[PDB]
Nucleic acid binder design. Structure first.
Length: 53
DNA sequence: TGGCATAGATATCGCACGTCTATTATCCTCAGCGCAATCAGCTGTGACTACCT
C-alpha cells in the first residue's frame, strides 16, 4: 500500500498539501514547524513550490 | 480535410470570520509607629521646731 501511495507524483491542488504527511508544503508550516534538514530531498514541484516529507 | 476562436465543466488560491489559551502580578487587612486635653509627682513656698549664744 505504501509503495502504491508513493506512485502518485503530486496532487493537483496546493490546498491538498496542507497538513499532509506525504505532502507537507512550505507555506503551510506552523509556528513550531521547521524543515530539518534544510537540504532535504524534494518530492516534487507544485506551481513552483517544492514538496518535502 | 486541417488549425484555432470560443463555449462548457472544475477547481483553486487569496481573503475574511469564529474560536482558544497562554508557560512568573495586583488587591483587602492587621500590628506597629505617630498626634491632642487631664492628672499625678517634682519642684517651689510657707510655717514648725531643735540648737547655739
Amino acid at each position: 500500500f505504501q509503495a502504491k501511495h508513493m506512485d502518485q507524483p503530486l496532487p493537483t491542488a496546493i490546498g491538498l498539501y496542507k497538513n499532509h504527511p506525504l505532502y507537507a508544503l512550505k507555506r503551510h508550516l506552523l509556528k513550531y514547524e521547521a524543515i530539518y534538514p534544510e537540504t532535504a530531498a524534494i518530492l516534487g514541484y507544485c506551481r513552483g513550490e517544492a514538496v518535502y516529507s
